[PDB]
Chains A and B, each alone.
Chain A
């Protein structure tokens, strides 16, 4: 499912970006 793929990538990237942004 292309939706499922590009959905799960997008969400992981936002998650990893937001984690990066708050790292200490």
Chain B
């Protein structure tokens, strides 16, 4: 119930970050404060990664949403192996979701509004299943996340 709502809030955050990444309409409402902070911090990471891991990223292809989900889950499983969760690492999850979605679109003639939906879903599931309780204990998105990153 709380966990259900928590998953749905993570999903909306992921959707909005990935829409931002594909330069696609909000058009319903203005981003919340947490959305804006997330877009700023997660994008700085996407940028740093794509810049400084370019050689590593070039040595594989994301031909499918199926495969994006696979590479994402294995990179993420290995990242969080030590069991350490913090706000900074949580930001890297959104960012890598973004790196792959952008990889997917550059290899597709046209991905559909559906690709970014399916990616937002697997991003959200990982964050929720791996960090959802931690987020809940550390002030959630309005206090925790925003006060951490101004």
Q: Which of A10, A12, A21 contacts B86 (CB 8 A)?
A: A21
- Residues of A contacting B: mostly: helix
Which 7 pairs between the two chains have the least Cβ-Cβ distance? A20-B88, A21-B88, A17-B89, A10-B78, A17-B88, A17-B92, A21-B86
Interface size on A, residues (CB 8 A): 19
Q: A2-B60, A8-B56, A21-B87 are in contact. Are A16 and B49 (CB under 8 A)?
A: yes
Q: A17-B92, A21-B86, A21-B87 are in contact. Are A6 and B74 (CB under 8 A)?
A: yes
User: In the bound complex, what is the Cα–Cα distance between A5 and B71 (angstroms)?
Assistant: 10
Whether a CB of chain A sits under 8 angstroms from the CB of B8 is: no
Interface string of B51-92 (1 = CB under 8 A from A): 011001101100000000001001110111110101111111
Interface string of A1-24 (1 = CB under 8 A from B): 010011111111110111111110
Q: Find chain A residues with CB under 8 A from B57 CB.
A: 9
User: In the bound complex, what is the Cα–Cα distance between A16 and B97 (angstroms)?
Assistant: 15
Whether a CB of chain A sits under 8 angstroms from the CB of B96 is: yes
Whether a CB of chain A sits under 8 angstroms from the CB of B133 is: no
Given A17-B45, A22-B88, 13 other A-B contacts at CB below 8 A?
A9-B96, A10-B81, A12-B49, A13-B49, A13-B89, A13-B96, A14-B79, A16-B48, A16-B92, A17-B92, A18-B84, A18-B86, A19-B88
Q: Find chain A residues with CB under 8 A from B82 CB.
A: 14
Q: Find chain A residues with CB under 8 A from B92 CB.
A: 13-14, 16-17, 20
